[PDB]
Structure formats: C-alpha cells, structure tokens
Amino acid sequence: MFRNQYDNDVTVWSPQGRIHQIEYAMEAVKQGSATVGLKSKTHAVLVALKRAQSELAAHQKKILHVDNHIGISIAGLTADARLLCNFMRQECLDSRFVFDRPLPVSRLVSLIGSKTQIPTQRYGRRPYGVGLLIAGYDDMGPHIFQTCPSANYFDCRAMSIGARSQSARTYLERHMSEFMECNLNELVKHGLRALRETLPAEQDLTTKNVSIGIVGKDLEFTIYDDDDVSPFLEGLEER
C-alpha cells in the first residue's frame, strides 16, 4: 500500500532500500518455461521445455547457439533474449577476430552483467526481463552460468530457471553429488529427469516438447530437437 510511489521506476529507491522494478523483472523470468543446466567433468548440457500452445505451432526456440563453445537457454521475455543473444554473438566474433581464441565463458558472462546492469540504474529504461542458463566450454572446463534480470550472474554446478523450476532444483540438489563422473548419456538423462520434475504427474517428456544442447570437451555446441532427442529420451525410466 505504501509502495505505490516507489515501484513504478527503476530509478526510485523505496524507503526500505529496495528497487522494485528489478524484482518485477525477476518475476518476468519466472513467467517462462523451465530450462535446466548441469555439467559433468567433461560436458555441459542444457535441457529446455518448449511450449507451442499444445498444437499447430512449431515450439519456441528456447536453446540458442552463441559460439562453437557457448550456448544459452532462455526464460523470460523473448525480445530481451534476442537482444542479449545478439550481444553475446557479437562479443564472441570480436574475440575470435582480435585474439584468434574462443572468448572465455566467465568473461562473456561478466560483459552480460555490465550490459544488463546499466538499464537498472538509468532513466527511460527497464531491466532485461530474461534469465539465461549459459553453458560453455573453454580452457577451464565445462561451465554453467545463470544470469538474472538484476544483472547478477552465478557459477552453478547445476541450475534450473523458469516456471515451476523449484522442483528441478530440488532434484538437482538431491542428485548433484554424482553429476561429475556421469558420462554424456546419463548426464543428459539427469537433466531430463529434473525437467520432468517440473511437470504435472500426468504429463511426460516427449520429442515434441524437449530441446537439448550439449557442449563438451570434444563436442561443439549442438542442439537436439524434435527427433534428435529420441536417443536421450529412450532409457528414461518412468516417474
């Protein structure tokens, strides 16, 4: 009630010391659909749930390709995800041009942090309403990063973001002690079981609603979609 003067702009501090448009942008992230990221000692996989209005539409393109070693999964506003993906792709190109080597994932994520922090201080802007799960591979191994509308980024052992992603995070917290020595097949299965935990008890993972993206020691970032996910889904025990 005493909140109405201080939550309409990202340039107003509430007398409790809170910016409220930042928190509302975080809600905008929660309005997507669940996507999961997890990594082993050699691979970093991204698993996403697609919505297509349940019929007559090709599903959302939820996993995007940024470079040969970086790929992102989005939850939140699509326009913001595309703006940030264009930024990431341009930065990776610039690194390859100037320095001839793949841009480190942590450096890319730091650049995203600055870029998305500027709208949360300036007038006439709004925070980015998209949260990302960045999967990378560089000299330092696999990486999973989570970026937020607040311009925070986190180094994750595993992470789920999106709508009803708390269930996936509960699964990942329960099972993260065995992710590292998993091979690619059962790592993708772990991600698939977490993503399934974000679903009603009746619905089940199919090829039509699952998108997978692997990067790893030998692999470049590849996205598996709509029929390429069948090898990964065939072996997934029932719930």
Binding site: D9, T11, V12, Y123, G124
Partner: protein
C-alpha cells in the same frame, strides 16, 4: 526519479512560488547545517584564518582523514561546510577551475575570481531542471597581491561576497553577531589576535573549551602566502596562550 519536474511550489528548483521564492535553494541552505559543524573565517591586518570544528564520533575511524580544510591552489585554502560529499566535489571543481585560470591567463587565480567562478556554476545549477544545488558552503582565504588578506563565501544560491570575518554552519548567526561586536571595536589584529578571535568565536558560540584535536585551523599570511594547516602542537600552543590570558 526518471525525469519530469515535481509539481509544487517548493518541490522543483525551477518553480517559483507565488511570492517569487525558490524554495529548493533555501532547502539547500538548510542542507548546509547537515553535519552539525560551524566554521569561522577571520581576516586580519596581514593574515586570514579559517577555523572549523573537527568532530570524529568513532574510535575506529582514522582521524587524519577527517578534514574540512582543503587546498584549492597553492595559495588558496578553503573550509567547506555542509554535506561532505558535496563539499569534496565542489573542492574538486574549484581546483579544476583554478588550474584552468592559470592556464588561460598566465597568473594564479585570485580569491574573488575563484568564488565568482564557483558561484557562476552554482547559479547555473539553480536555473536548470536537471541539476540541483550543492548543499555546501565554501569560505576561501588567500593573500592577493595589493589588497591583502581575503575571505570570501560562496553559497548554494550562487551568491558570493567578500567579508572581514564570516561564519557558516549551525551557529552562523551567533558567530556573525560575535564577530560584528569584535570588528566594531578594532580590526587590525596582527596574526595571533586573528587566531584568538576565530577560536574564541567558535568556543563561545558553542560554549566549548577546545582541545587541539577538536578544532582545525588553516592560515595564510602576507609573509608566508601559502595555505598552511596548523599541526596539533601549534593549535595547542594557541589554546594554552588563550587560556593563560
């Protein structure tokens, strides 16, 4: 915050009230008292002295970093009263403007010209809707060439004026009355008498017997034109010499 002007007669800087008053400038003048410190500057026959309170309400705080006396040029020093960050930013601006003056005109800036430049900038702040006044007061001292000691006081409205003695802060009115009474009697205070006058004004309107660590004193002299900040031993010597009398 984003943009626009707040509606109200006392809520934006570019709004007059029915009586033609800019109330945000007066609220900046009240911001000068935010800090609870008083400054006294006294002009003598051949010296100018700035004296300010030094409150350090923290055992953990390094007391050599708490200071309100600043060096603008080699020969101009100021005591800043008001909001601390605003004071330090206006000192930074005065330093830049003085360096530019020396660059353009080939000789070092006078005191009146420095306070005039700072007050011109302050006026620009009061007229535009994007900026706000600084909640601080600048009292500048220097020895000119052929006028003598100079004490000048810029203020948040863009007003500046030279004085024979001036005060800023909480006890500005009490100190101004004290110094008026002192200056009516005699004014050619040598150098010691100006320091005693400034310290006595501060210690009377505050009714506080000072310690060398509760007070800051910066001086210029005709024979030593460079701005100098007295050490605690020198202030203690002045205080014991004032107490014995």
């Amino acid at each position: 915050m984003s943009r626009g002007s707040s509606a109200g007669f006392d809520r934006h800087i570019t709004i007059f009230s029915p009586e033609g008053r800019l109330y945000q400038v007066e609220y900046a003048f009240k911001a000068i008292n935010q800090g609870g410190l008083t400054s006294v500057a006294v002009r003598g026959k051949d010296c100018a002295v700035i004296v300010t309170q030094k409150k350090v309400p923290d055992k953990l705080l390094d007391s050599s970093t708490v200071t309100h006396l600043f060096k603008i040029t080699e020969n101009i020093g100021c005591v800043m009263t008001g909001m601390t960050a605003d004071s330090r930013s206006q000192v930074q601006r005065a330093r830049y403007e003085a360096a530019n003056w020396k660059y353009k005109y080939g000789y070092e800036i006078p005191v009146d010209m420095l306070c005039k430049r700072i007050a011109d900038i302050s006026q620009v702040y009061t007229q535009n809707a994007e900026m706000r006044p600084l909640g601080c007061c600048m009292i500048l001292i220097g020895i000119d060439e052929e006028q003598g000691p100079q004490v000048y006081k810029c203020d948040p409205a863009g007003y500046y004026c030279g004085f024979k003695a001036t005060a800023a802060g909480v006890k500005q009115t009490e100190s101004t009355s004290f110094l008026e009474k002192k200056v009516k009697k005699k004014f050619d205070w040598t150098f010691e008498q100006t320091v005693e006058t400034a310290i006595t004004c501060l210690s009377t309107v505050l009714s506080i017997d000072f310690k060398p660590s509760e007070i800051e004193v910066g001086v210029v002299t005709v024979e030593n034109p460079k701005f100098r900040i007295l050490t605690e031993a020198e202030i203690d010597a002045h205080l014991v010499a004032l107490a014995e009398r």
